Amino acid sequence: GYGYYRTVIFSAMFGGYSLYYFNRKTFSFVMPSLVEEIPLDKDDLGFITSSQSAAYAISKFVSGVLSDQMSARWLFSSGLLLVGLVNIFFAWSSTVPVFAALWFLNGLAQGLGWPPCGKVLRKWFEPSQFGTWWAILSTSMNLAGGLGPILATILAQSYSWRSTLALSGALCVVVSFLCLLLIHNEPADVGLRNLSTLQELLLSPYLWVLSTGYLVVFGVKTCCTDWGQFFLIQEKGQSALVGSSYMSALEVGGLVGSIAAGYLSDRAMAKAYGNPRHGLLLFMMAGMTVSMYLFRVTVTSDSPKLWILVLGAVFGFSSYGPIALFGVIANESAPPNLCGTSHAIVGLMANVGGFLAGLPFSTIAKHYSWSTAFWVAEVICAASTAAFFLLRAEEEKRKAEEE
Amino acid sequence: GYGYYRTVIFSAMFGGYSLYYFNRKTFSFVMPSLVEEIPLDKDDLGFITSSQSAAYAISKFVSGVLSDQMSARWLFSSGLLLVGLVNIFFAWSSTVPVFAALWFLNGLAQGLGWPPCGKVLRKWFEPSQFGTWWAILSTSMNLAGGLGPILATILAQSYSWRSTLALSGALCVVVSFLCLLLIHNEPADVGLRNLSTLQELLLSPYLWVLSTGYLVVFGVKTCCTDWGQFFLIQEKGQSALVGSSYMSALEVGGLVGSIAAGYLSDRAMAKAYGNPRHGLLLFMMAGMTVSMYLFRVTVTSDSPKLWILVLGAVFGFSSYGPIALFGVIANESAPPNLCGTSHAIVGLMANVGGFLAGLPFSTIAKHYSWSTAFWVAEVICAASTAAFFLLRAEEEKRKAEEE
Ligand SMILES: O=P(O)(O)OC[C@H]1O[C@H](O)[C@H](O)[C@@H](O)[C@@H]1O
Ligand SMILES: O=P(O)(O)OC[C@H]1O[C@H](O)[C@H](O)[C@@H](O)[C@@H]1O
């Protein structure tokens, strides 16, 4: 049947991208035994993670451009095979520049992971279900991040870290051959019914307004995810338990935000005036701005724990939600032969927004105050969200004037 | 006549791009009076320069893509006008995040500067003269860098730094209107005789082998320019006067290398088997590898000053030379409507090679030794240069087999 290929290919991509994120952060989960066996400076550890971040930032865009042309099955399986062979070679090595070079190749293959999954989810799933299964597939990132330290502590108690990364690399090689076997690109490959130029995509204004939206939303996400603890410890005087539980509540609210963004977006798509994924997306950006206002103004030193966890969960539900919806709309607004380029340009905007949110936000916070910095982030987000409400109201006016 | 428009438009672009590089580094030349008037931390200064570097790295590629479509006169003049207005607004301001935001906009407009000059040099100059005037136009970068601290010290002795940057911004606004007036795009605009798709450019293998060549050459240039002083002070025990005079000799040899690369390349073009710019380019990469071998092995603690200045000048003649020739060939191998995209992809390779040469080279140097790091750079350069000799020998074999 059709549902058989549906659930088998989604389970194969779920296991595959789960092992991708489990090996995107394996050095981070195996850090204690690694610094116990050989001493590594903190600058070297930040350097290895930064080299993976740079390789992953390049390979987002390069893998989108290659996933438009090359078939997604072989690309996904070759990336996961390079992940497995890189982690086995990482277990063979015992020195810092070889750690960095191999982990750079891991960052390249981790970039190579996701755009094949995006292409296969576009080909197999009609847009009545594409957003919610996009959400459940990106939930494997949270699943690997949640079973990271638990399985890492179990495998470090039961095995050495050399054998731990050898088992992770061997598991990813075996699952890469199983994902070469089980995944199919399109239904026309299996006998089922299968369901523009690049200059037209680059000159399309919808892609660039989605670009600016994802820049704003990922900048606000990176600002709060990196600096909410510093905004609560230093200026507002909350305790470190409150800041850590705030960040955990923001992660849980963000998981629920991705899931409910995908599901309510597919409910709005099946129930229906333009794109049906905008009425949820702009409501979530409005919830982002309202949660930032309530977090900047109403939280004080005497504010209770329940209210600040509520604001963490409301910001999580309203920040990872628009990131998942921007991923869905970027994979959806483009033609099926140019979808990976659209999602790759949105990943380039992730890189630009992460730069504008990481280091200059700390400078604005250090020179003026932390409240002035989150006021700048709130003003940029509120001006952007009000601009999007004005834009879609103008487009409703245009669709009324053409009648 | 034709030579009138030739020399007037080249003098206008020479003055314009000279004021571009003079305002690319104006904060660096006005640093002493600025840190005297208001205290700024070293991390803040490195942050302002890094924000300019990031904006310039983005705006290389964005300005290449826009300079293919938008006319080069208005683009060049609007970039220089934004440079002038940004430096005037920088003189109005007195705080570090506004310094960073304005200097980010300066980095954007500095990226916007050069690809219009590349398009106008391609349109006005036949390839019998295009390389040498490319070299003389990129020599205005060295001219502004050489008259930077001298004119900065004179204007700081005669004026305040607020008035210094106000005069620099006013000069760039007036010269931006003069470059709107004097520059012409093509000879068909002035009544003189004027002399493919993007997917065909991206799928062209010549552009990507030029990409890997510029990655290798700019990586070796960034390695030696950033770490030759550290390779001579620490491991080989030379003095700081010898290291500083080595770096000055490398800059002078690189200036002569850009000039003689452009001139000997246009001599080889007018005297003529494929591209005539390869017989100079690969000889300069071979001279780069030979100079690195002689600098790694023959330089010792007892090596004289004259020999190490000779190796600095030979490496300079053989490193900025291939960078200028890669710029010429990137502006030349593409069609005239897609030349800025080709030079923009080569600028993206500048960014990638600068990343692979800046921070991991210090890690390879710190963990193993400095000699092992420059041995890695020499082995990558020698393997790349031998690969290019094998590739052009294979292409000579192909042009013999087609006969
Ligand atoms: O591991 P990270 O740096 O958080 O990036 C993870 C993200 O990378 C890309 O943008 C993918 O489209 C996302 O599905 C994924 O969640
Ligand atoms: O100022 P820099 O960082 O040294 O960059 C300067 C260089 O930028 C671009 O690559 C231009 O094509 C070059 O002509 C110019 O020399």
SS3 readout for chain A:
CHHHHHHHHHHHHHHHHHHHHHHHCHHHHHHHHHHHHCCCCHHHHHHHHHHHHHHHHHHHHHHHHHHHHCCHHHHHHHHHHHHHHHHHHHHHCCCHHHHHHHHHHHHHHHHHHHHHHHHHHHHHCCCCCHHHHHHHHHHHHHHHHHCHHHHHHHHHHHCCHHHHHHHHHHHHHHHHHHHHHHCCCCHHHCCCCCCCCHHHHHCCHHHHHHHHHHHHHHHHHHHHHHHHHHHHHHHCCCCHHHHHHHHHHHHHHHHHHHHHHHHHHHHHHHHCCCCCCHHHHHHHHHHHHHHHHHHHHCCCCCCCHHHHHHHHHHHHHCCHHHHHHHHHHHHHCCCCCCHHHHHHHHHHHHHHHHHHHHHHHHHHHHHCCHHHHHHHHHHHHHHHHHHHHHHHHHHHHHHHHCC
Q: Are B137 and B76 in contact (CB under 8 A)?
A: no
DSSP E strands: which ranges in B197-288?
A: none
Residue A193 lies in a domain: no
Experimental method: cryo-EM
Contact check, Cβ <8 Å, B96/A367: yes
Could you tell me the resolution of this structure in angstroms? 3.4
Contact check, Cβ <8 Å, A352/B58: yes
Task: Calculate how close chain A gets to B42, using CA atoms only, in Å.
Answer: 12
* Interface residues from chain B to A (CB-CB < 8 Å): 44, 47, 50-51, 54, 58, 95-97, 100-101, 197-199, 352, 355, 359-360, 363-364, 367-368
Residues B162 and B209 in one domain: no
Give the residue from chain B lying closest to A200, CA to CA: B198
B216: CB partners within 8 A, 6+ apart: B353, B380, B381, B384, B385
Is A331 close to ligand 1, i.e. is its CB under 6 Å away?
no
Residues A240 and A96 in one domain: no
Residues B71 and B214 in one domain: no
Query: Could you give the 3-state DSSP secondary structure of residue B273?
Result: coil
Residues B25 and B129 in one domain: yes
Q: Any idea which residue has 């669709």 for tokens?
A: A399
Q: Are A219 and A356 in contact (CB under 8 A)?
A: yes
Whose atoms come closest to the Cα of A116: which ligand? 1
Task: Calculate how close chain B gets to A43, using CA atoms only, in Å.
Answer: 10
Whose atoms come closest to the Cα of A121: which ligand? 1
**Chain A positions in Cβ-Cβ contact with residue B367 (cut-off 8 Å):** 95-97
For residue A109, CA distances in Å to A40, A359, B87 come to 25, 27, 43
Q: Are B87 and B23 in contact (CB under 8 A)?
A: yes
In whole angstroms, give the CA distance from residue B256 to residue B87.
Answer: 32
Residues B30 and B120 in one domain: yes
Q: Encoding tokens for residue B347?
A: 């600028």
Contact check, Cβ <8 Å, A363/B47: yes
Cβ neighbours of B288 (radius 10 Å): 29
Closest CA to A179 of A59, A65, A344, A18: A18
Q: How many CA atoms lie within 13 A of B293 on its CB side?
A: 10
| Rounded (5°) CA angle B163-B165-B167 | 65
Contact check, Cβ <8 Å, B100/A360: yes
How many Å lie between the centroid of ligand 1 and the Cα of residue B170?
45
Residues B102 and B185 in one domain: yes
Per the structure, the complete domain to which residue A288 belongs is given by: 198-401
Q: Are B261 and B386 in contact (CB under 8 A)?
A: no
Letter for the amino acid at A38? I
CA dihedral of residues A209, A212, A215, A218 (deg, nearest 10): -50
Q: Which of B58, B112, B141 to mutate to test the pocket of ligand 2 (most atoms within 8 A of CB)?
A: B141
In whole angstroms, give the CA distance from residue A44 to residue A19.
Answer: 25
Residues B118 and B208 in one domain: no
In whole angstroms, give the CA distance from residue A15 to residue A82.
Answer: 16
Query: Could you give the 3-state DSSP secondary structure of residue B128?
Result: coil
Residues B226 and B141 in one domain: no
Residues B167 and B218 in one domain: no
Q: How many CA atoms lie within 13 A of A340 on its CB side?
A: 28
Give the residue from chain A lying closest to B202, CA to CA: A65
**Pick from A135, A158, A187: which residue ends a domain?**
A187
Residue A369 lies in a domain: yes
For residue A63, CA distances in Å to A108, A111, B197 come to 9, 6, 21
Length of chain B: 403
In whole angstroms, give the CA distance from residue B279 to residue B266.
Answer: 12
Question: Structurally, how many domains does chain A consist of?
Answer: 2
Work out how many CB contacts closer than 8 A connect A with B. Answer: 47
**Chain B positions in Cβ-Cβ contact with residue A367 (cut-off 8 Å):** 95-97
* Interface residues from chain A to B (CB-CB < 8 Å): 44, 47, 50-51, 54, 58, 95-97, 100-101, 104, 197-199, 352, 355, 359-360, 363-364, 367-368
CA dihedral of residues A328, A330, A332, A335 (deg, nearest 10): -160
Pick from A100, A199, A364: CB nearest B363: A100
In whole angstroms, give the CA distance from residue A273 to residue B233.
Answer: 69
Ligand 2 atom, smallest distance to B141 CA: 16
Q: Are B17 and B136 in contact (CB under 8 A)?
A: no
Identify the helix (H) or strand (E) that includes residue B361. Answer: helix B339-367
Residues B166 and B247 in one domain: no
In whole angstroms, give the CA distance from residue A260 to residue A270.
Answer: 15
Residue A192 lies in a domain: no
Task: Calculate how close chain B gets to A340, using CA atoms only, in Å.
Answer: 15
Is B114 close to ligand 2, i.e. is its CB under 6 Å away?
yes
**Pick from A187, A209, A238: which residue ends a domain?**
A187
Contact check, Cβ <8 Å, A50/B199: no
CA dihedral of residues A268, A273, A279, A285 (deg, nearest 10): 140
Residues A10 and A148 in one domain: yes
CATH code for position B146: 1.20.1250.20
**Pick from B146, B170, B189: which residue ends a domain?**
B189
Identify the helix (H) or strand (E) that includes residue B52. Answer: helix B42-69
Contact check, Cβ <8 Å, A360/B51: yes
Residues A143 and A237 in one domain: no
Cβ neighbours of A171 (radius 10 Å): 16
